Amino acid sequence: SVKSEYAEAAAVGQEAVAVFNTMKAAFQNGDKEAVAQYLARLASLYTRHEELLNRILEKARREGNKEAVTLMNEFTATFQTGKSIFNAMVAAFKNGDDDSFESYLQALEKVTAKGETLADQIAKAL
Numbered sequence: 001s002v003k004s005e006y007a008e009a010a011a012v013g014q015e016a017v018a019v020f021n022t023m024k025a026a027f028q029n030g031d032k033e034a035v036a037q038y039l040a041r042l043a044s045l046y047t048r049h050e051e052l053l054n055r056i057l058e059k060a061r062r063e064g065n066k067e068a069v070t071l072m073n074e075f076t077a078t079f080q081t082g083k084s085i086f087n088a089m090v091a092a093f094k095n096g097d098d099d100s101f102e103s104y105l106q107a108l109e110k111v112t113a114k115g116e117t118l119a120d121q122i123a124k125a126l
């Protein structure tokens with residue numbers, strides 16, 4: 001069901017949270033080789049999450065589930081904010097700009113905590 005596809009999507013999202021926090025520890029410790037690998041892993045996890053979210057939104061639309069579509073439109077919008085900040089974080093790592101990396105990192109943590117009530121609302125609406 002779309003609801004079980006959203007649970008699969010949620011888990012992938014939580015995997016990115018898990019890796020992201022491990023990455024943050026590596027960054028603070030100066031283990032740049034680890035950070036590079038974690039950033040690669042996170043790109044794969046975000047790409048997969050984005051795709052699952054789009055399939056869920058498209059299915060909710062085909063089902064006529066207006067409330068779920070409204071919530072998923074808000075949610076996917078926020079996901080594009082994370083994407084843009086994540087992209088700038090990766091660029092800051094490439095450029096050796098630790099100040100920008102720190103900034104973007106705290107931004108992404110706010111994105112995830114800011115949207116978790118909406119994430120839970122979606123589960124109940126699908």
Ligand SMILES: Nc1ccc2c(c1)S(=O)(=O)C=C2
Pocket residue numbers: 046047078079080081082083084086108111112
């Ligand atoms: N693409 C992408 C990258 C990072 C983050 C997200 C999306 S999010 O908005 O799910 C939270 C962090």
